[PDB]
């Protein structure tokens, strides 16, 4: 799971750190910690990368939508003019 | 946003260090960076992975948008034809 797992790792990462840094209790040797704080980071990066394709499609959808709105804008812009002409001609 | 999330994660990976007043100032940033990262993840536009939407959907929305594009452009040519006329 990209996003979900991405959010779990961040949790357990902060956990492990907080212990290592002494905010919470942990036994004196406490390397398991340091090792974890590296496996988790690598997992996050890997997970984040695998997510790029998804964010790219979004990049596309944003393009498309921007276009679509721009166009509808031009159409609106023209209808305005017609009305403005209609005014100068009627009123 | 996905880029700021990458650069953000990058800076955090590079943050850990020493102890004391430093140890606290170093772990304080790590706590804020974790917040910042969680906010970016939340704000990622609904791509795939359920952050916003799956992939199946993203493909649908793209096909739906292409179709609306063809139409809005047909409308656009008509509007211009008439203005020009």
Swiss-Prot record, chain A:
Belongs to the Mediator complex subunit 4 family. Coiled coil: none annotated. Component of the Mediator complex, a coactivator involved in the regulated transcription of nearly all RNA polymerase II-dependent genes. Mediator functions as a bridge to convey information from gene-specific regulatory proteins to the basal RNA polymerase II transcription machinery. The Mediator complex, having a compact conformation in its free form, is recruited to promoters by direct interactions with regulatory proteins and serves for the assembly of a functional preinitiation complex with RNA polymerase II and the general transcription factors. This is Mediator of RNA polymerase II transcription subunit 4. The gene is MED4. Component of the Mediator complex, which is composed of at least 21 subunits that form three structurally distinct submodules. The Mediator head module contains MED6, MED8, MED11, SRB4/MED17, SRB5/MED18, ROX3/MED19, SRB2/MED20 and SRB6/MED22, the middle module contains MED1, MED4, NUT1/MED5, MED7, CSE2/MED9, NUT2/MED10, SRB7/MED21 and SOH1/MED31, and the tail module contains MED2, PGD1/MED3, RGR1/MED14, GAL11/MED15 and SIN4/MED16. The head and the middle modules interact directly with RNA polymerase II, whereas the elongated tail module interacts with gene-specific regulatory proteins. It comes from Saccharomyces cerevisiae (strain ATCC 204508 / S288c) (Baker's yeast). It comes from the Eukaryota. It is found in: Nucleus. Present with 1617 molecules/cell in log phase SD medium.
From Swiss-Prot, chain B:
One of its GO terms (molecular function) is structural molecule activity. It is found in: Nucleus. A motif (Nuclear localization signal) lies at residues 13-35, 72-85. The keyword Transmembrane does not apply. It comes from the Eukaryota. Keywords: Activator, Nucleus, Transcription, Transcription regulation. GO terms for cellular component: core mediator complex; cytosol; mediator complex; nucleus. GO terms for biological process: negative regulation of transcription by RNA polymerase II; positive regulation of transcription by RNA polymerase II; positive regulation of transcription elongation by RNA polymerase II; positive regulation of transcription initiation by RNA polymerase II; RNA polymerase II preinitiation complex assembly. Component of the Mediator complex, a coactivator involved in the regulated transcription of nearly all RNA polymerase II-dependent genes. Mediator functions as a bridge to convey information from gene-specific regulatory proteins to the basal RNA polymerase II transcription machinery. The Mediator complex, having a compact conformation in its free form, is recruited to promoters by direct interactions with regulatory proteins and serves for the assembly of a functional preinitiation complex with RNA polymerase II and the general transcription factors. Belongs to the Mediator complex subunit 9 family. Present with 1364 molecules/cell in log phase SD medium. Component of the Mediator complex, which is composed of at least 21 subunits that form three structurally distinct submodules. The Mediator head module contains MED6, MED8, MED11, SRB4/MED17, SRB5/MED18, ROX3/MED19, SRB2/MED20 and SRB6/MED22, the middle module contains MED1, MED4, NUT1/MED5, MED7, CSE2/MED9, NUT2/MED10, SRB7/MED21 and SOH1/MED31, and the tail module contains MED2, PGD1/MED3, RGR1/MED14, GAL11/MED15 and SIN4/MED16. The head and the middle modules interact directly with RNA polymerase II, whereas the elongated tail module interacts with gene-specific regulatory proteins. This is Mediator of RNA polymerase II transcription subunit 9. It comes from Saccharomyces cerevisiae (strain ATCC 204508 / S288c) (Baker's yeast).
């Amino acid at each position: 799971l990209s996003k979900v797992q991405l959010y779990e790792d961040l949790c357990r990462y902060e956990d492990t750190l907080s212990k290592l840094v002494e905010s919470v209790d942990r036994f004196k040797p406490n390397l398991d910690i340091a090792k974890d704080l590296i496996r988790t980071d690598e997992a996050l990066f890997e997970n984040v990368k695998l997510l790029a394709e998804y964010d790219n499609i979004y990049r596309n959808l944003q393009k498309i939508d921007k276009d679509s709105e721009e166009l509808d804008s031009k159409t609106r812009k023209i209808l305005e003019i017609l009305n403005e002409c209609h005014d100068e001609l009627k009123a | 946003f996905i880029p700021h999330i990458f650069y953000s994660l990058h800076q955090i990976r590079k943050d850990p260090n020493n102890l004391s007043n430093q140890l606290e100032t170093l772990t304080g940033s790590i706590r804020h960076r974790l917040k910042l990262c969680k906010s970016l993840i939340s704000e990622n536009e609904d791509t795939k992975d359920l952050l916003s939407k799956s992939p199946s959907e993203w493909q649908d929305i793209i096909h739906q948008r292409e179709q609306e594009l063809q139409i809005k452009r047909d409308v656009l040519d008509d509007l211009y034809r008439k203005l020009q006329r």
